[PDB]
Chain A
């Protein structure tokens, strides 16, 4: 019979910086 399945691989590396935030509100009228 086959031997045991091998160990799981290590954790993945970090993801990209996320999507840019929305433009801010306009200055007060005013």
Chain B
């Protein structure tokens, strides 16, 4: 007799990291 279907594959790689965060707010006046 034919066996059962094999198990589901493993998940793929984690996705690429997101873009670097936005540049910070401008600092206070001197």
Contact = CB atoms under 8 A, between A and B. Distances in A.
A3 B6 CA distance: 4
Chain B contact residues, majority secondary structure: loop
B13 A4 contact: no
Interface residues of B, number: 28
Contacts of A27: 27-30
B9 A24 contact: no
B12 A10 contact: yes
A3 B3 contact: yes
Contacts of A13: 15
Interface of B: 3-30
Interface of A: 1-29
